[PDB]
């Protein structure tokens, strides 16, 4: 994730110009290889046309260039690319909203799971750790960065997310399917045990805990669903072929022809297809942004900071339910007890 | 479902190029017959024009080719196809989200339906099986793959989803309408019996069970609604006719005319309508993706793995509420009891 | 509603071709009169131009035809029609989702309203009948088919949805506004009476009943709101005028001119405006689909089966809360008590 | 609001033609002045060109007309207008859904706030009146029609929505911000008093009342938010300037030039720019529909019937919670106690 | 925020014309510098072409102008800008809906946290202040205006949102991540203390408080998420480059060429590219509106009134839960105890 929200807080004269000088998370970083390859093939064709081909071969090549320039428009590149990129961007923001956060659960656990003794601390810390462990299991399932951090369950145990007893129980469970849900069932069992023990003082508090756990588990499941149900491979194939075929057609049809031949709209030889290069930049860049966003759990610059989120979620959850439990400042009268650096349209 | 999420985790130089070599779930698999038929009709017309027709018939055919090339644009193929495909894709993802999953219910049942004895196991297993049975009944109603797996209720009974006593009760119910809802009413009755028996310890836990059951039943009902209320047949007819009429017009108007006649934009005979074939590829491919996605419960490669989901849901539900009930590891102090391989914009 | 979900489960070679032979719910059924009228006016103009007008009148008519062909593009038909049809289709699916279904309520009532005696049966049947009666009142308010079935409240009483005592109470209520909500208030009162009587065993069950009743009543209200707040009449007028004006312009500008006059793009007289007819087919068909979908509660083929839904909802509700109450098969150990015909991306 | 849902229930031969004869809520009513002004300026320019200007001034004017006709396309009128109108229409339907309705609250109050005595009637009537008063305060804040009906709080007191004691409390509250929320806080306090008094029999019923009150208050707040956060003024300015500049360009570039000069596409003088007038009709009409819908709380024909809704909501709420409380017909066996004028795809 | 809802309540003859005279929140204010710079570069190029370049250099410049005019269309400016602006506007309204409001919480607190004594006042005021403090912490994290108002936590303490004891607890918490959530955990702890003390009278009221707190905290978290996950920098770079490259191309290709050279569509020298300036106005204005809306928490005229909202929320919350607690007017019979200045389609 490359944040630039601060840089664009106010609409200024050089508003988006200053963002063109960024390299991390940039279009240039994602596209310089493809742009160089396109320019290389174009210059190879241009050198062949200018120096290698005979006069008759040049006339045939010019006829082919005009044909491919005219009929390259029949490729619905804008049509297919717009649809695909809209679908990918919607999925991208939806997938970010699907990452499970323990904030709701840590508020509820701090409010509902009671006891200053070691057992109360154990209950609160274990509930938040089960939530974190479910998040880690699904994230290492769906995120290449989290997988590289946790390539085995041994790594997850060594990171403190899973104990060795919990590891024995987890691997002893006979299932061929993804086990990210297992800590959520542990959470439900532990919440029921805590309520039966009296650590949870009422049935409504237990109901709230289970509702927030189900929201968290739904988010983990939704991450699994987005990972499994890819954007239909046929859409990806079609848009990739559309871009490739259109730009091979442009490699042919955007060549500068000899202005001595008096071909219409062919009288200025600039030797470098500046607009064709800009059109490639924009269209191939759009597809590269979809390429980068299609799996936002990879290791691209604008991919989600999944490992940062794991560390932040674990630290904040443990702070919220252990350090901060029943740790209020004494109720003190505020500044305005005895009270800087629009009403409506029809009034 | 053909997953390729891993292959596109990072935006790489050969980003989407390597996905063009896939055959399962590909555009080539869905479109090679239609592409061959279009090319066959085009080559039949081309052979007739080149070898069969007389000179006067050739001049008339060339006038007709230019007319059909000019006025084939009056068919709003892009207009109708874009609308249709957007509607189908929205319905497709909505329909995937509508498939009932027992994860919420199995978390709640593991947390709320109590007893290590045989009767507690029976209650939890039976509640999850009623949920699974409702899912199976609606899925065999809406999915051709699940129907082929369960062509009779006898098959469902033999698969263990329905008992023989439950089969007698189910067929003895006098209703001409789809009975997928019957196990949900069984679930409500059984949850009430469990609460009255004391297996469910509080009224709030029963309320949570009934709320999650209603979410599950709503998902089953929504699957029935999507199966019943098709994309309006008039849209499907209109887009099919648009594609067919446009490409028959192109079969006429994209023919290569004799360059000796000096027709404008007709001076290069390539004998194979490469761009017209690419345009057919993209437009007919878009319609074929809508064709494949319009009923995502068929047996296409990118159709949902409904039978896999049935097996996974049943196995995971039975694991969650029977093997995993009250089966926590002893509460153990974690690694950070005494504590790898952004703050904001305005700071 | 014309369902064809089964016919398109798999993407086949003749995928959407076989749906072009359907007549019920077809574009041909909605559009053959308009297509015939357009063709009749076109042939009247063509016959006048070919046989009636003098040479000077023919030259003036040809100038007018070229003018109207050129400047008919200034009508934003695609612009206005796309916006309108998207709005109508969104409203159409939203309106289908707004039809009240008693499935949630019948699950809750079967789970919560207790007693095998006649009084328990009366309570459950009466609650589901109040829900059904609210649905019938709003549906006869908004649906022409349901109104034809229930043109008076006498018809509703004779159908068993309302008793005669309830009819006296209903007509004795002094209100000039639609009374579809009245049975929902009866439902709330009856649920409170049932809870006070002990038929509902707990306050949380009563709360769940009232929440599901409010969901049902919200759906009835939303149906009233969609019926009242039409698609803005100005949009309907604008799109109707756009289609009509554009196709009158085409009636003028698509005429085949005498090829002897050597007008550019006028040298092939086909005597039948095949593409213009296809363009009319697609554009007028799009507007006709919006026409049919704009009120999905009429008697069009693809309009909702409101009377079928009323009968199904009543029968299934009465089955669920009367026949099926506390009527479980004895808890029996399933087949897998002692256990046919993907893990993640990063693994 | 101009309802025409009934007129379009069935897709008929003269489907949308009969709606073109409506004047109330019509495009003609909103656009006849602008259309007359555009036609007046066009005819002034036409008369100047035909009668006033000299030959050289005519040649210069013809060059300018051709220039402005060619380059008027550079104005993205379709681009900006489509975006703006989609945003306005989405906000319009969202704003209609945001109008608070007391139906949920009146169902809950009839079910939960008990007592046939005068005090129970007072509690139910006062709770529904607080809801109605919050609706009236925000509506007179946001709606010009409701403001004209209630230009002072004295008017609201005289209408029975606020008592004089409540008026003293309301004006004695020291706040510079909109006080529409005040009756909602009164509602919360009164609901707590009713529960403490035993009129509300359980804590879950009080929780349901407060949840429905918060839904109602959220709707009032959302109306305030939509009134405050206008569609960004820069969008409105940009689209207004786009329409105005484009049609001034058309006032220049759509002039009929002397056909004797042999200008291409200028050989038929119709003296009335029929298509240009139709294009103005459609584009300016689209902007006028956005103009009318942008504040749907004004006094346009298709603006919401806010005063009708206030009267209906008050009357129906008072009927529901006072006349209809505990006023059921005796539980009577229905017609089908001893039982007119699709199963699935894969079956 | 520049509200103009009142000015457009009714669709009037001069409907949007009168909004073109506004300067605050206007397109002119955001765009006059860019428009002046574009016009300056254009006039520099025009002066060079008219006075400086030789005849041969003029002929080459004219060839380049025609080339750049023809092929500037290959830049998908409309394509990329439409996508970007739609994404930004959706995020903009979503971000406005994500600003936490204490209205739900103040209704619940006034209804549920009891006691007229000093301790009850302290509990209610402290709960609302914790909510306000969470809002302030996240807003100074995400909003430049709120940061300028609260550049240190010392400023927040001096404003009365945080006490000094709470400041000691807040800074003593060991966390490297944003601490906006801390007051929400304080809220959960304080609500639990209030329920345990008997100030909250029932467990369902505590559950409602925690649910509304979690809604509030979710809104604060969502503000953090929108601030962190910017619109992908690659989209911003691509659209900025598209606008810049297209308008540099227009700086070249929109130059008025010497009409003596008889270049087609170059025969009228207006010396000022009025349409090109209008096209720049619209396209650059669209991008400037996205620039202004992309971070709606800056100090632009149409940016959200975050400091006004902070002051309003604090004042209204303190009014609602302190002044207005248990402060009803005596239950009085309303005006219509003994009862001005549509039924349905199918009736
Ligand atoms: Ca990625
Ligand atoms: Ca399929
Ligand atoms: Ca209809
Ligand atoms: Ca209005
Ligand atoms: Ca800003």
d(CA D315, CA D322): 11
Q: Please, where are the H alpha helices in C198-305?
A: 203-228, 233-253, 274-294
Is residue E300 annotated as involved in ligand binding? yes
Method: cryo-EM
Residue C262 and residue C276 in contact, taking contact as beta carbons nearer than 8 Å: no
Q: DSSP 3-state assignment of B200?
A: strand
Its sign, for the CA torsion C269, C270, C275, C276, is positive
C-alpha torsion angle, residues E129, E130, E131, E135 (rounded to 10): 100
Taking ligand 3, which is a single-atom ion, which protein residues have CB atoms under 5 Å away?
C 292, 295, 298, 300, 303
Tell me how far apart the 2 most distant CA atoms of chain D are, in Å: 97
Residue D242 and residue E289 in contact, taking contact as beta carbons nearer than 8 Å: no
Task: For residue B47, count other CB atoms closer than 10 A to its CB.
Answer: 10
d(CA D342, CA C59): 60
Chain A's closest residue to E310, CA to CA, is A340
d(CA C24, CA C18): 14
Nearest of A134, C10, C218, E1 to residue D102 by alpha carbon: C218
Q: Please, where are the H alpha helices in B198-294?
A: 203-228, 233-253, 274-294
The closest CB to that of A185, out of B304, B324, B335, belongs to B324
Per-residue HEC secondary structure of chain E comes to CCCCCHHHCCCCCCCCCHHHHCCCCCHHHHHHHHHHHHHHHHHHHHHHHHHHCCHHHHHHHHHHHHHHHHHHHHCCHHHHHHHHHHHHHHHHHHHHHHCCCCHHHHHHHHHHECCCCHHHHHHHHHHHHHHHHHHHHHHHHHCHHHHHHCCCHHHHHHCCCCCHHHHHHHHHCCCCCCCCCHHHHHHHHHHHHHHHHCCECCHHHHHHHHHHHHHHHHHHHHHHHHHHCCCCHHHHHHHHHHHHHHHHHHHHHCCCCCHHHCCCCCCCCCCCCHHHHHHHHHHHHHHHHHHHHHCCCCCCCCCCCHHHHHHHHHHHHHHHHHHCCCCCCCCCCCCCCCCCCCCCCCC
Scored b (16 or more CB within 10 A) or e, D304-320 reads bebbebbbbbbbbbbbb
Residue A216 and residue E216 in contact, taking contact as beta carbons nearer than 8 Å: no
CB pairs under 8 A between A and D: 25
d(CA B25, CA B3): 9
Q: How far is the CA of A10 from the centre of ligand 5 (A)?
A: 4
d(CA D90, CA B71): 36
d(CA C93, CA C95): 5
d(CA B211, CA C110): 14
Residue A100 and residue B305 in contact, taking contact as beta carbons nearer than 8 Å: no
* Binding partners of E (≥3 Cβ pairs within 8 A): A, B, C, D
E331–chain C nearest CA distance, Å:
23
Helices C274-294 & B55-71, crossing angle to 10 degrees? 30
Q: Tell which of A147, A179, A233 to mutate to test the C interface (max C CBs under 10 Å).
A: A147
Resolution in angstroms comes to 3.2
Under an 8 A CB cutoff, do A227 and B3 touch? Answer: yes
Residue A301 and residue A25 in contact, taking contact as beta carbons nearer than 8 Å: yes
Please work out, in degrees rounded to the nearest 5, the angle formed at the alpha carbon of residue D6 by the alpha carbons of D5 and D12: 100
Q: Is D117 left (phi over 0), alpha (psi -120 to 50) or beta?
A: beta
Q: Which-ligand-closest: CA of C145?
A: 3
The closest CB to that of E208, out of D207, D225, D237, belongs to D207
Collect all residues with Cβ–Cβ distance below 8 Å to D60 and sequence separation of at least 6: none
Scored b (16 or more CB within 10 A) or e, B73-92 reads ebbbbbbbbbbbbbbbbebb
Task: For residue C260, count other CB atoms closer than 10 A to its CB.
Answer: 8
The closest CB to that of B228, out of D342, D346, D347, belongs to D342
d(CA C277, CA A209): 64
Nearest of C216, C197, C219 to residue C208 by alpha carbon: C216
Q: Please, where are the H alpha helices in chain A?
A: 27-47, 55-71, 77-98, 103-112, 118-142, 144-149, 153-158, 164-172, 182-197, 203-228, 233-253, 274-294, 306-318
Under an 8 A CB cutoff, do B342 and A305 touch? Answer: yes
Collect all residues with Cβ–Cβ distance below 8 Å to C25 and sequence separation of at least 6: B232, B233, B234, C1, C2, C301, C302
Q: What residues pair up with D200 in beta bridges, in sequence order?
A: D113
Q: Please, where are the H alpha helices in A229-341?
A: 233-253, 274-294, 306-318
The closest CB to that of D80, out of E30, E212, E286, belongs to E286
d(CA A114, CA A200): 6
Q: How far is the CA of C293 from the centre of ligand 3 (A)?
A: 5
Number of alpha carbons in the 13 Å side-chain half-sphere of residue C196 = 14
Residue D184 and residue D209 in contact, taking contact as beta carbons nearer than 8 Å: no
Q: How far is the CA of D5 from the centre of ligand 3 (A)?
A: 9
B297 chain-D contacts, CB cut-off 8 A: 345
Task: Please provide residue E113's backbone torsions phi and psi, each rounded to the nearest 5 degrees.
Answer: -100, 110
d(CA C320, CA B171): 14
Task: For residue C339, count other CB atoms closer than 10 A to its CB.
Answer: 10
d(CA A135, CA A310): 8
Collect all residues with Cβ–Cβ distance below 8 Å to E315 and sequence separation of at least 6: D175, D176, D177
Collect all residues with Cβ–Cβ distance below 8 Å to D182 and sequence separation of at least 6: D134, D137, D170, D173, E324
d(CA B242, CA B248): 10
Chain D's closest residue to E90, CA to CA, is D87
A318 chain-B contacts, CB cut-off 8 A: 336, 339
Under an 8 A CB cutoff, do C343 and A228 touch? Answer: no
Task: For residue C24, count other CB atoms closer than 10 A to its CB.
Answer: 9
| Radius of gyration from C-alpha coordinates of chain D | 29
Q: How far is the CA of A297 from the centre of ligand 5 (A)?
A: 29
Q: DSSP 3-state assignment of C200?
A: strand
Task: For residue C57, count other CB atoms closer than 10 A to its CB.
Answer: 12
For residue B302, the 8-state DSSP code is T
Its sign, for the CA torsion E107, E108, E111, E114, is negative
E343 chain-C contacts, CB cut-off 8 A: 141, 177-178
Under an 8 A CB cutoff, do E342 and C228 touch? Answer: yes
The closest CB to that of C334, out of B83, B163, B297, belongs to B163
Structure tokens at B134: 């409702």
Under an 8 A CB cutoff, do B166 and C281 touch? Answer: no
Residue A214 and residue B108 in contact, taking contact as beta carbons nearer than 8 Å: yes
Q: DSSP 3-state assignment of B266?
A: coil
Output the DSSP codes for C211-237. HHHHHHHHHHHHHHHHHHSPSPHHHHH
Nearest of A275, C290, A38, D336 to residue E70 by alpha carbon: A275
E225–chain C nearest CA distance, Å:
25
The closest CB to that of C214, out of D3, D93, D107, belongs to D107
Nearest of B329, E47, E193 to residue A114 by alpha carbon: E193
Q: How far is CA D64 from the centre of its chain?
A: 42
D179 chain-A contacts, CB cut-off 8 A: none
Per-residue HEC secondary structure of D287-339 comes to HHHHHHHHCCCCCCCCCCCHHHHHHHHHHHHHHHHHHCCCCCCCCCCCCCCCC
Q: Tell which of D137, D147, D221, D238 to mutate to test the A interface (max A CBs under 10 Å).
A: D147
| Radius of gyration from C-alpha coordinates of chain A | 29
Structure tokens at D209: 């009342």
Under an 8 A CB cutoff, do A282 and E185 touch? Answer: no
Residue D76 and residue D173 in contact, taking contact as beta carbons nearer than 8 Å: no
Is residue A265 annotated as involved in ligand binding? no
A12–chain B nearest CA distance, Å:
16
d(CA B303, CA B144): 11
Helices A77-98 & A233-253, crossing angle to 10 degrees? 140
Residue A220 and residue A181 in contact, taking contact as beta carbons nearer than 8 Å: yes
Under an 8 A CB cutoff, do C267 and B71 touch? Answer: no
D269 burial class (0-12, 13-18, 19+ CB within 10 angstroms)?
middle
B202 chain-E contacts, CB cut-off 8 A: none
d(CA E60, CA E66): 10
For residue A10, the 8-state DSSP code is S
Structure tokens at B19: 């996905």
């Amino acid at each position: 994730t490359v944040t630039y929200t601060a840089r664009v807080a106010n609409a200024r004269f050089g508003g988006f110009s200053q963002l063109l000088l960024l390299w991390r998370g940039s279009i240039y970083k994602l596209l310089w290889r493809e742009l160089l390859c396109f320019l290389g093939f174009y210059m190879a064709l241009s050198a062949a046309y200018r120096f290698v081909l005979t006069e008759g071969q040049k006339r045939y090549f010019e006829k082919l260039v005009i044909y491919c320039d005219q009929y390259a428009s029949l490729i619905p590149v804008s049509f297919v690319l717009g649809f695909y990129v809209t679908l990918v961007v919607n999925r991208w923001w939806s997938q970010y909203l699907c990452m499970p956060l323990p904030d709701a659960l840590m508020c509820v656990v701090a409010g509902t799971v009671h006891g200053r003794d070691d057992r109360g601390r154990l209950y609160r810390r274990t509930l938040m750790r089960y939530a974190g462990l479910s998040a880690v299991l699904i994230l290492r399932s769906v995120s290449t960065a989290v997988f590289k951090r946790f390539p085995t369950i041994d790594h997850v145990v060594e990171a403190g997310f899973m104990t060795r007893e919990e590891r024995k129980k987890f691997e002893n469970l006979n299932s061929s399917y993804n086990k990210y849900w297992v800590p959520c069932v542990w959470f439900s069992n532990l919440a029921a045990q805590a309520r039966r023990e009296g650590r949870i003082r009422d049935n409504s508090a237990l109901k709230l805990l289970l509702e927030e756990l189900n929201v968290f588990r739904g988010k983990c499941g939704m991450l699994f669903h987005y990972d499994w149900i890819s954007v239909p491979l046929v859409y990806t194939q079609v848009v990739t072929i559309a871009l490739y075929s259109y730009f091979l057609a442009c490699l042919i049809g955007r060549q500068f022809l000899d202005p001595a031949q008096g071909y219409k709209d062919h009288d200025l030889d600039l030797c470098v297809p500046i607009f064709t290069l800009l059109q490639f930049f924009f269209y191939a860049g759009w597809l590269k942004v979809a390429e980068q966003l299609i799996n936002p759990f990879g290791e691209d610059d604008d991919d989600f900071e999944t490992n940062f989120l794991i560390d932040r979620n674990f630290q904040v959850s443990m702070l919220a339910v252990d350090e901060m439990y029943d740790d209020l400042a004494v109720l003190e009268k505020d500044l305005y007890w005895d009270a800087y650096t629009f009403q409506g349209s029809t009034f």
